[PDB]
Amino acid sequence: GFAWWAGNARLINLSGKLLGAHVAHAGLIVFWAGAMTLFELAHFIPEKPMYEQGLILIPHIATLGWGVGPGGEVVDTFPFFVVGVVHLISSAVLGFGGVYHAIRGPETLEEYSSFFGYDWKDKNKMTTILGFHLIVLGIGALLLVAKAMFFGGLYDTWAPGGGDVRVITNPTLDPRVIFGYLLKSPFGGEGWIVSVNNLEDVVGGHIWIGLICIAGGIWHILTTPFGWARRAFIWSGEAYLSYSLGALSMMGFIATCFVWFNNTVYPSEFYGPTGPEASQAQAMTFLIRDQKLGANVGSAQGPTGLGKYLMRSPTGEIIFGGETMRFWDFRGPWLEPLRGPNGLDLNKIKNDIQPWQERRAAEYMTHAPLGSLNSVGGVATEINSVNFVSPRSWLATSHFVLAFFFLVGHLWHAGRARAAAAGFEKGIDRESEPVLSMPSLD
Amino acid sequence: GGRIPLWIVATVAGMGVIVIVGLFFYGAYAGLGSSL
Amino acid sequence: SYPIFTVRWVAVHTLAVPTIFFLGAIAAMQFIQR
Amino acid sequence: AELTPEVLTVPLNSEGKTITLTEKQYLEGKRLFQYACASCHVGGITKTNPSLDLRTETLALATPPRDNIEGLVDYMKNPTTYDGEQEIAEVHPSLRSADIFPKMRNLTEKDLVAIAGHILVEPKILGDKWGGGKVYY
Amino acid sequence: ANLWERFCNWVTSTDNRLYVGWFGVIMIPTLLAATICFVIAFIAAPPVDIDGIREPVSGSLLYGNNIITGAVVPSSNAIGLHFYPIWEAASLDEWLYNGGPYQLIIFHFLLGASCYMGRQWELSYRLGMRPWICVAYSAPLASAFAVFLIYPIGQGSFSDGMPLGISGTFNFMIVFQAEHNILMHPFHQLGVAGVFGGALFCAMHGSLVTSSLIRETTETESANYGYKFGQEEETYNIVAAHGYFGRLIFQYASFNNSRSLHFFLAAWPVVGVWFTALGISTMAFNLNGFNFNHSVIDAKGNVINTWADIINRANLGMEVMHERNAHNFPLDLA
Amino acid sequence: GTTGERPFSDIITSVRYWVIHSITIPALFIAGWLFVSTGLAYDVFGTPRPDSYYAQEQRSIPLVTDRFEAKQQVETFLEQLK
Amino acid sequence: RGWFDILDDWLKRDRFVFVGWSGILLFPCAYLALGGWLTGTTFVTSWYTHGLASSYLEGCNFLTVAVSTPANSMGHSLLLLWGPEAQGDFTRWCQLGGLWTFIALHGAFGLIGFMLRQFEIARLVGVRPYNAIAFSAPIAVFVSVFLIYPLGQSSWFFAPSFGVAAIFRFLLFFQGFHNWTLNPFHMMGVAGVLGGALLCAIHGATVENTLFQDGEGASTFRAFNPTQAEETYSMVTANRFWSQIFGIAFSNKRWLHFFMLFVPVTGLWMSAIGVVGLALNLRSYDFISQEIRAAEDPEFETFYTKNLLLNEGIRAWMAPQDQPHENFVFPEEVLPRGNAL
Ligand code: CLA
Ligand code: CLA
Ligand code: CLA
Ligand code: CLA
Ligand code: CLA
Ligand code: HEC
Ligand SMILES: CC1=C(/C=C/C(C)=C/C=C/C(C)=C/C=C/C=C(C)/C=C/C=C(C)/C=C/C2=C(C)CCCC2(C)C)C(C)(C)CCC1
Ligand SMILES: CC1=C(/C=C/C(C)=C/C=C/C(C)=C/C=C/C=C(C)/C=C/C=C(C)/C=C/C2=C(C)CCCC2(C)C)C(C)(C)CCC1
Ligand SMILES: CC1=C(/C=C/C(C)=C/C=C/C(C)=C/C=C/C=C(C)/C=C/C=C(C)/C=C/C2=C(C)CCCC2(C)C)C(C)(C)CCC1
Ligand code: OEY
Ligand SMILES: [Cl-]
Ligand SMILES: [Cl-]
Ligand SMILES: [Fe+2]
DSSP, X not given: OOOGGGGGGGGTTOHHHHHHHHHHXXXXXXXXXXXXXXXXXXXOOTTSOGGGTTOSSHHHHHTTXXXXXXXXXXXXXXXXHHHHHHHHHHHHHHHHHHHIIIIISOSOSTTTOTTTOOOTTOHHHHHHHHHHHHHHHHHHHHHHHHHHHTSSOEEETTSSSSOEEEOOSSOOOOXXXXXXXXXXXXXXXXXXXXXXXXXXXXXXXXXXHHHHHXXXXXXXXXXXXXXXXXTTSOOSHHHHHHHHHHHHHHHHHHHHHHHHHOOTTTTHHHHOOOHHHHHHHHHHHHHHHHHHTTOOTTSOBOTTSSBSSXXXXXXXXXXXXXXXXXXXXXXXXXXXXXXXXXXXXXXXXXXXXXXXXXXXXXXXXXXXXOEETTOOBSSTTOOSOOOOOOHHXXXXXXXXXXXXXXXXXXXXXXXXXXXXXXXXXXXXOGGGOGGGGSOOOO | OOOXXXXXXXXXXXXXXXXXXXXXXXXXXXXXXXXX | OOOSSOHHXXXXXXHHHHXXXXXXXXXXXXXXXX | OOOOTTTTEEEOSSSSOEEEOOHHHHHHHXXXXXXXXXXXXXXXXOTTOTXXXXXXXXXXXXXXXXXXXXXXXXXXXXXXXXXXXXXXXXXXXXXXXXXXXXXXXXXXXXXXXXXXXXXXXHHHHHGGGXXXXXXXX | OOHHHXXXXXXXXXXXXXXXXXXXXXXHHHXXXXXXXXXXXXXHOOOBOTTSSSOOBOOSGGGTOOTTTOEEOOOOTTTXXXXXXXXXXXXXXXXXXXXXXXXXXXHHHXXXXXXXXXXXXXXXXXXXXXXXXXXXXXXXXXXXXXXXXXXXXXXXOGGGSOOEEHHHHHHHHHHHHHHHOGGGSHHHHHHHHHHHHHHHHHHXXXXXXXXXXOOOSOTTSOGGGGOOTTOSXXXXXXXXXXXHHHHHSOGGGSOOOHHHHHHHHHHHHHHHHHHHHHHHHXXXXXXXSOOOTTOOBOTTOOXXXXXXXXXXXXXXXXXXXXXXXXXOSSOOOO | OOOSSOOHHHHHTOHHHHHHHXXXXXXXXXXXXXXXXXXXXXXXXXXXXXXXXXXXXXXXXXOOOOSSXXXXXXXXXXXXXX | OOHHXXXXXXXXXXXXXXXXXXHHHHHHXXXXXXXXXXXXXXXXXXXXXXXBOOSGGGTXXXXXXXXXXXXXXXXXXXXXXXXXXXXXXXXXXHHHTHHHHHHHXXXXXXXXXXXXXXXXXXHHHTOOSHHHHHHHHHHXXXXXXXXXXXXXXXXXXXXXXXXXXXXXXXXXXXXXXXOGGGOHHHHHHHHHHHHHHHHXXXXXXXXXXXXXXXXXXXXXXXXXXXXXXXXXXXXXXXXXXXXXXXXXXXXXXXXXXXXXXXXXXXXXXXXXXXXXXXXXXXXXXXXXXXXXXXXXXTTOOOHHHHHHHHHHHHHHHHHHHHSGGGOOOOOGGGSOOXXXX
């Protein structure tokens, strides 16, 4: 009894048609990933930084070690091509299967086969489908391990000499590190799982999650929900969808912070500098310039009485001054050579800054992730000229929006699934209004 | 009375706007008003 | 049996006719170079 | 007002010879300056060293004088400090340093003339705005 | 008859004058903490080095503020996004100087408010209602998250979250316009449309229902006494109201289905305020309003100003002056 | 529910409707187009062309500064272009 | 049954667009105001009055086009096409800003027409005239902002110009010069607009989630009949809910819907009064106690003093370009500026 605008709710109990819808929808996702990569490649110019070019897919591929060499220089675009083509081709197959099951295929599965057919209230069947996909997901995570250890490695922004592609031979297995991250605070200087800053920990966590997902898939194939879970949840398709909505929302919020703060699995070489990074780089830039003119940056008092170039953090570390004091938790490969045990080392600042570090600071400062909707780069008072919005702003903003609506989608479908399950989603029964049988409040 | 199906009139009005509006966005990057 | 020309008829064309004229004017404008 | 050959006539060197660009060259120059230079020099300032702008009066007091096509073309090959006392190709884009500034790899000699031409024209059009900063936006 | 089952039964009781519920078990303490700390800080808190530059701003009534100027001031820029609970300070003296109460108040409040939204789902379930009033409240909730949490996360500091005070609010707006050109952002424009239209349709609907009240009273009594709580008969004539509105505009621009009308009322401001919360939340990552600065130039290349450039002149005056002692380098990157 | 005018759904799906309007709608669009492309719109309304905001060596607004001589003032500026 | 009653008959016939006697005033004025604005933003410059481009023809987009106000030199001239300024020359009329007064005045009489239309239709249909009454708030706002405010000032030049960005500039002007956010009459306007939007959303949501089950389908919209006598949602359950969530709830549907009229209408009336004061520069600019202390005590800083520095920046940085008739020349050294920026 749904209206056209709620028309896909007509599929709830048509498993063969609902299968075609998912598989056709999976084809669109594969299609876009293929089309968009090729579109990016056709536009790519290798002499420009990726992040002056509106690229978000090519950086995800470079980061896996394909096509790049030392310092993120693109050496070979053919891998990019291959990824686009293969996705694009594969979408026709998913497309084919989706429209077949959606139009011609059996409308319902449970008569054609007892294996593929399902009933949402069959808690056992449901947890078996769950277990199958968990095993898939665990295999997925191990592919990333396989790449990193056996098939060429991964791009490492922290490698010596500019960063470079590196095979990971000692992935971190120590659970105290791996789950250590999951118990770090999400606040500044800690940053929960977003602070992961080396490929050993990245690959080791994927070994773990791969094992955990396979273990859990086998667990869920072999078992049925215990009574306490039986009585805690709503067991319906719309309830299950609302659970996944909640989870995707949470993941979207996390990915937003990952791309905004993390410069390890989003190398700044490809994505542009982070906000903190660019801000730190501005202080570095003027520290350098002023010191070449003879300024003693260690002993320069700023207008506030705090140091103009260098000051202390609240726990004592020597950090960049000005408003960037907020960003002193920033860590990046162009800066760390200057850190000593107490923070920035004044003797290395006076003696050991290298031209490449001058270059990289000047470059990141002039590529801060600020820009207008119409891609005028920089603060909102800048004149037109520079056509630039960071990949990072594009990826962070889009995913905050998506993550938000999915939380709204979670609330919508969770509340409805509860009400439908108890039988009052279509409204209040006039002849049995619960408030009219309750005593008055006063 | 009903000789033209309404959905077709709707589809073709539809692209009619998409074209005029897309021209107007193209024009934001060409010529007057493009900053160039 | 309906009438063609009505008050409604006039209200509509009093808006629709200048609209298309302005749209053509505004379309031409996109090809003006400085 | 319009983009006349008077405004498109800029000095070629210090000897006083001059050269008239075309509107094609100017727009080519503006495009290439945007591609290669505006990230630091938008509107004729220098975001990473505001004390040195691209005003013609400033280029003229540079050593080698830089207020002419030749001086600008040489600067893009072998940039020096304002007193000319040191070469700075390792921290400033140039053809000498196109290994480390990859946007300079595909610039031809004629691209340089246009970039240089745009820099010398633009203050004739904008006035104080070129190199003046936000005060003049 | 078990002790826990009896507790569960009071928690979830529909007879409590105010509904507690499981979300209420978190909401009650967190909002109490935030309320009590707010009231005391607003009255007596000493000045706070909001911008980390050892330049304390006085926010409370006893330090020379009035109701309009007072505020609980954001925590120091020197803290950035670090967690600063009381037990992380050497003393309350230090916590107060560095803005500790702002953090205490907003974290408890965002929690309690989030639980406020859950509580609306929960009671709706206990009373046999449909469930989506909480979805309407997610619009203001999202907006508070944006100015108290999201925007500081993207800018790297709670010192740039919104102050808890009337004038502090205006300071946040002016600084925001200078750095994000928020007026020229479509998501703010939609928020204005959701909020102007919200007020519009509030007045419209209130006037249309009020216009078609059925005569039930004399002129010496409030017409309001023509309605008795819980009467089954509607108290106005929707066909008369549609007959007026459809003629004021034209027939098909008027609702005669009360359900579609009231759903319209819910949707328009909710959706507009989602967008404007999303606008704040996306300008938190510096994807700013449209920039048409110097977009029109003449045949020679002279700049021809538009109203957008004038806006920019205003924006620059806001830029150059804000936090006038806090910037040592020429770009305010965050 | 109806006031006697012919329903729109019935008109815009009618063949006679589209017979007339497949001429009138393009005719109007072309006319609008030509108002601009011929330059007539500039002249009717007084709008400067890209070449005529300023005289060549000039960056002063020709701002109207008198109330009753304002008409003559604008013409004084327009003649400072010819 | 002479001509006048025959004409009344025709004006009041039930047709797709009711005309009425009010239509004679409303329809020409509304249409000319609408047409003047579309004409001006498509084709007409603001070069001679403001030194701005402002039409599609000139390279502007939907956000930057405007029908701008006349030059400050026009004072409050009515700028009649046949008046002494334009002297019947259409082209000069356009270049001097005549289209602005054209739109303002015709809009004003169109607004009158519309409110008379609400009166007329309500008398014919037999309902009470509360929608007309509510519309007094938009009228008050419009005359106070577009007519009274510039009439207290030096010229129409300082009225709002009809344009998206031009109105944005009007907002910022009022902050920098009038400190309008500090004005309790505006604050009451804010609480009325935001209070209305809240009432709007909370009332629609409530009804939609206390619906009675009156049909069998998942679309609850089909289960309403406009001639049914029964209320379509439970006021009793709605009241319980809000009583237990918020502590208090509406219990009287008549009060509730009158309250929805009251809140936004009152809020707008209040902001209009504030704007009448600003006509005279009667601002809520300062708190004297705050300034006495701050001048004497240079460690004393509030959000109040911080916002006035911002106002001072706005004034100095926008005045020369926004008020070109004043020929303000502010050398670099006099512009107020924090460190570095
Ligand atoms: C990803 C988007 C998506 C997907 C996959 C689906 C899928 C589906 N919908 Mg939903 N729907 C959607 C969006 C989507 N919908 C939207 C946006 C709306 C709002 C308008 C609706 C409204 C809606 C309604 C109202 C109903 C559905 C129904 C259905 C199902 C039956 C379709 C049918 O009988 O069509 C028949 C249509 C055709 C035969 C026309 C041609 C369609 C084909 C598939 C186009 C494919 C084109 C492609 C280029 C071909 C390449 C093939 C190549 C690879 C070989 C189907 C599984 C129906 C349902 O639930 O049935 C119980 C139903 O009643 N949908
Ligand atoms: C997850 C998605 C999904 C699911 C659950 C189903 C499920 C089903 N399909 Mg559909 N189908 C799918 C995708 C899917 N299919 C795709 C992608 C296509 C296009 C190729 C089709 C085309 C299709 C047709 C043409 C027909 C079905 C039919 C059926 C039924 C029986 C199939 C059978 O006996 O398997 C046989 C088992 C095998 C062939 C197992 C061998 C291993 C598989 C095929 C390879 C797996 C590789 C890997 C996991 C994925 C690809 C790698 C890639 C990442 C590069 C069953 C209900 C039939 C039906 O309903 O008849 C009435 C039928 O006629 N399907
Ligand atoms: C897609 C993933 C997925 C999904 C949907 C499920 C779903 C389910 N699992 Mg399975 N499970 C999975 C993966 C998954 N599982 C994996 C990978 C494993 C292997 C480790 C298991 C191991 C497992 C066991 C051992 C059991 C289940 C059980 C269940 C059922 C009850 C779950 C429950 O009450 O959670 C609700 C969870 C809680 C009430 C506890 C929350 C504890 C977390 C860590 C608190 C932290 C919250 C914090 C805000 C989030 C940040 C994380 C933090 C650590 C940093 C349900 C069907 C139960 C069942 O009935 O099985 C038959 C059961 O006993 N699962
Ligand atoms: C995994 C994602 C997912 C899935 C599978 C569903 C599935 C479903 N939803 Mg939920 N939903 C989701 C996410 C999801 N939802 C999110 C994120 C939200 C919050 C936004 C909602 C909010 C929501 C509501 C409010 C309702 C549903 C309903 C439903 C059912 C019918 C929906 C339908 O027919 O759509 C039909 C599709 C349309 C009408 C098309 C909508 C078009 C969108 C709004 C425009 C977006 C344009 C985009 C930004 C790009 C702009 C570019 C331009 C060129 C177009 C179906 C069970 C209905 C329900 O309860 O039924 C049980 C219902 O009333 N959904
Ligand atoms: C009801 C419709 C209506 C209303 C109220 C207005 C109102 C107005 N118009 Mg608009 N106008 C209208 C329709 C309307 N107009 C139409 C239909 C057109 C298109 C043709 C225009 C075109 C238009 C232009 C082009 C201009 C106006 C202007 C004005 C303003 C000045 C009018 C004035 O001075 O009148 C003076 C005249 C009267 C008040 C008429 C009074 C008649 C009395 C009662 C009888 C007098 C007897 C007579 C003189 C005897 C004749 C003698 C003979 C035998 C020798 C005013 C706001 C001006 C404006 O906006 O300023 C910028 C302007 O320039 N109007
Ligand atoms: C695109 C190829 C260009 C061109 C044509 C120029 N630059 Fe730069 N520039 C930068 C810095 C920090 C300085 C000061 C150098 C110093 O003296 O230490 C300069 C200087 C110049 C000049 C000289 C100006 C003068 O008044 O003498 C010129 C003519 C010049 N540049 C031209 C910084 C940058 C960049 C930062 C990454 C980038 C990119 C460019 N410049 C690019 C270009
Ligand atoms: C059911 C349904 C639906 C859905 C649908 C879908 C969603 C579908 C999908 C499907 C798909 C998803 C599709 C895909 C396709 C694809 C294709 C068909 C492919 C092709 C390819 C090609 C051909 C390629 C080629 C190439 C190469 C190889 C190289 C490079 C170049 C090129 C590119 C050329 C709808 C809603 C509509 C409606 C209702 C029903
Ligand atoms: C990969 C990687 C890694 C790792 C990771 C990991 C290992 C993960 C983990 C994760 C996990 C481990 C997670 C978990 C989560 C959980 C959750 C999320 C839960 C939740 C729950 C809930 C949701 C509940 C609810 C409820 C309640 C509370 C009551 C009753 C009812 C219910 C059930 C509803 C690292 C970082 C090292 C590095 C990089 C990469
Ligand atoms: C002033 C004047 C006058 C008058 C005039 C007029 C009356 C005018 C008219 C005019 C007009 C009457 C105009 C029109 C135009 C229109 C237009 C220009 C339109 C636009 C459109 C659009 C662009 C849209 C689009 C869209 C979108 C975007 C989305 C949705 C869909 C649509 C389609 C809606 C006279 C002569 C008396 C004299 C005096 C002066
Ligand atoms: O706008 Mn301007 O940018 Ca965001 O930081 Mn840099 O200055 Mn300061 O502390 Mn509050 O405020
Ligand atoms: Cl400030
Ligand atoms: Cl700084
Ligand atoms: Fe109502």
